[PDB]
Motif scaffolding. Structure first.
Motif, mmCIF file in Angstrom:
data_model
loop_
_atom_site.group_PDB
_atom_site.id
_atom_site.type_symbol
_atom_site.label_atom_id
_atom_site.label_comp_id
_atom_site.label_asym_id
_atom_site.label_seq_id
_atom_site.Cartn_x
_atom_site.Cartn_y
_atom_site.Cartn_z
ATOM 1 N N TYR A 212 0.827 -1.215 0.000
ATOM 2 C CA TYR A 212 0.000 0.000 0.000
ATOM 3 C C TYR A 212 0.861 1.266 0.000
ATOM 4 O O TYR A 212 2.102 1.191 0.005
ATOM 5 C CB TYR A 212 -0.885 0.115 1.252
ATOM 6 C CG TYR A 212 -2.077 1.047 1.092
ATOM 7 C CD1 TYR A 212 -3.056 0.791 0.134
ATOM 8 C CD2 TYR A 212 -2.232 2.176 1.904
ATOM 9 C CE1 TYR A 212 -4.164 1.619 -0.005
ATOM 10 C CE2 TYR A 212 -3.345 3.018 1.770
ATOM 11 C CZ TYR A 212 -4.302 2.723 0.811
ATOM 12 O OH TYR A 212 -5.427 3.500 0.685
ATOM 13 N N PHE A 213 0.190 2.416 -0.054
ATOM 14 C CA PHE A 213 0.821 3.696 -0.031
ATOM 15 C C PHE A 213 1.348 4.011 1.343
ATOM 16 O O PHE A 213 0.916 3.417 2.335
ATOM 17 C CB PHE A 213 -0.112 4.797 -0.542
ATOM 18 C CG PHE A 213 -0.562 4.594 -1.962
ATOM 19 C CD1 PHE A 213 0.308 4.829 -3.021
ATOM 20 C CD2 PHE A 213 -1.840 4.124 -2.241
ATOM 21 C CE1 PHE A 213 -0.086 4.595 -4.334
ATOM 22 C CE2 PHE A 213 -2.240 3.886 -3.554
ATOM 23 C CZ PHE A 213 -1.362 4.120 -4.598
ATOM 24 N N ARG B 73 -6.898 2.864 3.117
ATOM 25 C CA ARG B 73 -7.647 1.703 3.484
ATOM 26 C C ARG B 73 -6.820 0.662 4.239
ATOM 27 O O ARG B 73 -7.377 -0.218 4.891
ATOM 28 C CB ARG B 73 -8.213 1.164 2.169
ATOM 29 C CG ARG B 73 -8.996 2.196 1.369
ATOM 30 C CD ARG B 73 -9.530 1.513 0.144
ATOM 31 N NE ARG B 73 -10.164 2.454 -0.771
ATOM 32 C CZ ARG B 73 -11.471 2.691 -0.824
ATOM 33 N NH1 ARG B 73 -12.304 2.051 -0.011
ATOM 34 N NH2 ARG B 73 -11.946 3.570 -1.695
ATOM 35 N N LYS C 69 1.186 -4.060 -10.343
ATOM 36 C CA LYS C 69 0.158 -4.565 -11.206
ATOM 37 C C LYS C 69 0.746 -5.510 -12.240
ATOM 38 O O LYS C 69 0.244 -6.622 -12.435
ATOM 39 C CB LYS C 69 -0.515 -3.438 -11.974
ATOM 40 C CG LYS C 69 -1.060 -2.382 -11.106
ATOM 41 C CD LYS C 69 -1.701 -1.392 -12.021
ATOM 42 C CE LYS C 69 -2.409 -0.551 -11.018
ATOM 43 N NZ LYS C 69 -3.303 0.396 -11.709
ATOM 44 N N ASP D 71 -6.144 -5.337 -9.861
ATOM 45 C CA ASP D 71 -5.139 -4.313 -10.095
ATOM 46 C C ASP D 71 -5.221 -3.186 -9.075
ATOM 47 O O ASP D 71 -5.028 -2.015 -9.411
ATOM 48 C CB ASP D 71 -5.262 -3.737 -11.505
ATOM 49 C CG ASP D 71 -4.677 -4.649 -12.569
ATOM 50 O OD1 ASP D 71 -3.908 -5.551 -12.217
ATOM 51 O OD2 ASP D 71 -4.974 -4.449 -13.746
ATOM 52 N N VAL E 127 -4.801 -2.096 -4.537
ATOM 53 C CA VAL E 127 -4.322 -2.394 -3.219
ATOM 54 C C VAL E 127 -5.352 -1.743 -2.300
ATOM 55 O O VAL E 127 -6.040 -0.820 -2.753
ATOM 56 C CB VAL E 127 -2.923 -1.815 -2.952
ATOM 57 C CG1 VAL E 127 -1.881 -2.628 -3.689
ATOM 58 C CG2 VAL E 127 -2.869 -0.348 -3.356
ATOM 59 N N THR F 102 -9.768 -4.877 1.119
ATOM 60 C CA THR F 102 -9.756 -4.520 2.526
ATOM 61 C C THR F 102 -10.555 -5.462 3.428
ATOM 62 O O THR F 102 -9.997 -6.151 4.294
ATOM 63 C CB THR F 102 -10.317 -3.089 2.721
ATOM 64 O OG1 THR F 102 -9.671 -2.235 1.763
ATOM 65 C CG2 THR F 102 -10.029 -2.575 4.130
ATOM 66 N N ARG G 99 -13.023 -0.887 -17.633
ATOM 67 C CA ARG G 99 -12.839 -1.613 -16.416
ATOM 68 C C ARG G 99 -13.580 -2.943 -16.462
ATOM 69 O O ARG G 99 -13.024 -3.989 -16.074
ATOM 70 C CB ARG G 99 -13.290 -0.783 -15.205
ATOM 71 C CG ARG G 99 -12.125 -0.186 -14.379
ATOM 72 C CD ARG G 99 -11.329 0.754 -15.253
ATOM 73 N NE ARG G 99 -10.006 1.085 -14.710
ATOM 74 C CZ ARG G 99 -9.792 1.848 -13.642
ATOM 75 N NH1 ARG G 99 -10.813 2.372 -12.971
ATOM 76 N NH2 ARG G 99 -8.547 2.123 -13.266
ATOM 77 N N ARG H 179 -10.575 -5.305 -16.579
ATOM 78 C CA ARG H 179 -10.213 -5.562 -15.206
ATOM 79 C C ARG H 179 -11.060 -6.620 -14.510
ATOM 80 O O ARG H 179 -10.530 -7.596 -14.001
ATOM 81 C CB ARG H 179 -10.229 -4.233 -14.445
ATOM 82 C CG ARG H 179 -9.982 -4.368 -12.930
ATOM 83 C CD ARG H 179 -9.884 -3.009 -12.263
ATOM 84 N NE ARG H 179 -8.654 -2.306 -12.633
ATOM 85 C CZ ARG H 179 -8.280 -1.129 -12.139
ATOM 86 N NH1 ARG H 179 -9.034 -0.499 -11.249
ATOM 87 N NH2 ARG H 179 -7.131 -0.592 -12.517
HETATM 88 N N1 LIG Z 1 -12.562 -2.004 -2.753
HETATM 89 C C1 LIG Z 1 -11.123 -1.933 -2.767
HETATM 90 C C2 LIG Z 1 -10.720 -0.526 -3.132
HETATM 91 C C3 LIG Z 1 -9.218 -0.441 -3.383
HETATM 92 C C4 LIG Z 1 -8.862 0.835 -4.070
HETATM 93 O O1 LIG Z 1 -9.710 1.697 -4.343
HETATM 94 N N2 LIG Z 1 -7.590 0.897 -4.429
HETATM 95 C C5 LIG Z 1 -7.075 2.062 -5.140
HETATM 96 C C6 LIG Z 1 -6.255 3.013 -4.281
HETATM 97 S S1 LIG Z 1 -7.070 3.740 -2.827
HETATM 98 O O2 LIG Z 1 -8.365 4.279 -3.166
HETATM 99 O O3 LIG Z 1 -7.263 2.749 -1.795
HETATM 100 O O4 LIG Z 1 -6.197 4.773 -2.351
HETATM 101 C C7 LIG Z 1 -6.157 1.619 -6.228
HETATM 102 O O5 LIG Z 1 -5.231 0.854 -5.939
HETATM 103 N N3 LIG Z 1 -6.396 2.092 -7.451
HETATM 104 C C8 LIG Z 1 -5.422 1.895 -8.501
HETATM 105 C C9 LIG Z 1 -6.062 1.750 -9.851
HETATM 106 O O6 LIG Z 1 -7.284 1.608 -9.909
HETATM 107 O O7 LIG Z 1 -5.319 1.819 -10.823
HETATM 108 C C10 LIG Z 1 -10.693 -2.312 -1.372
HETATM 109 O O8 LIG Z 1 -11.338 -1.885 -0.420
HETATM 110 O O9 LIG Z 1 -9.727 -3.043 -1.238
#
Ligand SMILES: N[C@@H](CCC(=O)N[C@@H](CS(=O)(=O)O)C(=O)NCC(=O)O)C(=O)O
Ligand SMILES: N[C@@H](CCC(=O)N[C@@H](CS(=O)(=O)O)C(=O)NCC(=O)O)C(=O)O
Lengths: 221, 221
Positions: free
Chosen positions: A8-9, A14, A44, A52, A54, A67, B126, B130
């Motif tokens: 993750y970041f 999340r 990815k 794709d 996190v 999550t 998507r 995806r």
């Molecule tokens: N429903 C997913 C949502 C995950 C999500 O939205 N991931 C985003 C980043 S964040 O919103 O959590 O900050 C991501 O990796 N997106 C990258 C992409 O779509 O290319 C969860 O809860 O795990």
């Protein structure tokens, strides 16, 4: 044992709830922070992110994303998921409400500036008129130290995290919820938790102007 | 037995997945549709909505709110939740992805018109680049009839619902996913499912211009 790997970041987002839960269970974890879009693209491109995206946690030979899916697995594995079906129903209901308010608060530090005042007002109203009263209700209905089953469960941890965020948002909102205050202090004193709250832990700080602009583009167009 | 009571709008929304699951389990349910804001206000005023929101299902003496909490309870209760921890991890991961795409599609029939073209384009991308590839992957990896554990689970139902929505959105998106097409046909043939798909069931139709404007104000300011 095998130390879980969290992708993750370098931020709460999340993944924070998951970090909290693991720490609460006394499970040490390793993190792989995505610092740049290239890193995210590498992730990815490695084909280990089901959608794709996190959060994604490598554990028990699985590349578990989502999550709730992750939290769910960890909760059962470490026995922080109650003792049965009905208990889990309560746990689930409470947890979902916690998540909702959480996101609501997040949105605040993202919404188009010209509209902030109003949103803040709504979030505060909801916080003190809808959410806190609800948890306070639960605590009041049984007088016990834990939310569900009179034993530590994931929601206790979840509730704590939220209260800490509420405290950062506006601490006066918690002063009319005595049981919640006492609960907060109690959970914060749990060894594993206390440790996580201490500096130098993997507990992430709240998003800032510089470490916010990056994540927008890094999202991966 | 005690027939579960589902409180929600005369619409799919978040309650539809729950309707599908229950029907899949062959469990007959009663619904209490909120037709006006007054009804919603009555509901809230009755103090049975934990966070003053619906979905809310009365079952086993509980006034269970929160979609996932509800789905979760029903899944375990009727044994549509797999056989163990790892199975549930997969089930959870897949289910969450399904929900995400679902909402994404919903947003389409809500987004500010001037921006529709682009959003539709993203949702389609998507969908076919995806999501579908992911489920097709799962199906391909094992060649079995069910997604997880070679036995019917909630995700099979969840996957079906989504595919039906994708088919309503744009049916050409499913033609390059042979296993998914075969899966769709299979699940749709399950007696309980077939029945739910048949007219006269509690299966809700897609939101329309008149039955959309109301829900906005009805939301409860
Ligand atoms: N429903 C997913 C949502 C995950 C999500 O939205 N991931 C985003 C980043 S964040 O919103 O959590 O900050 C991501 O990796 N997106 C990258 C992409 O779509 O290319 C969860 O809860 O795990
Ligand atoms: N996280 C909740 C969300 C429920 C929710 O958003 N309920 C809305 C209606 S809808 O979005 O599902 O259509 C509501 O009742 N809001 C009423 C209110 O807030 O006054 C869940 O999944 O159960």
């Amino acid at each position: 044992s095998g130390k879980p790997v969290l992708h993750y970041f370098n931020a709460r987002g999340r993944m924070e709830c998951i970090r909290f839960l693991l720490a609460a269970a006394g499970v040490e974890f390793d993190e792989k922070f995505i610092q740049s879009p290239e890193d995210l693209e590498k992730l990815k491109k490695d084909g280990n992110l089901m959608f794709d995206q996190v959060p994604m946690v490598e554990i028990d030979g699985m590349k578990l994303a989502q999550t709730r899916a992750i939290l769910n697995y960890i909760a059962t594995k470490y026995d922080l998921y109650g003792k049965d079906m009905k208990e889990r129903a309560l746990i689930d209901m409470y947890s979902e409400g916690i998540l909702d308010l959480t996101e609501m608060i997040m949105q605040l530090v993202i919404c188009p500036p010209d509209q902030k005042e109003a949103k803040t007002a709504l979030a505060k109203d909801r916080t003190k008129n809808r959410y806190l009263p609800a948890f306070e209700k639960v605590l009041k209905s049984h007088g016990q130290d834990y939310l569900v089953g009179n034993k530590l469960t994931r929601v206790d941890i979840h509730l704590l995290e939220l209260l800490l965020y509420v405290e950062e948002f506006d601490a006066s909102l918690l002063t009319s919820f005595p049981l919640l205050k006492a609960f907060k202090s109690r959970i914060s004193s749990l060894p594993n938790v206390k440790k996580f709250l201490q500096p130098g832990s993997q507990r992430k700080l709240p998003m800032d102007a510089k470490q916010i602009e990056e994540a927008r583009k890094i999202y991966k167009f």
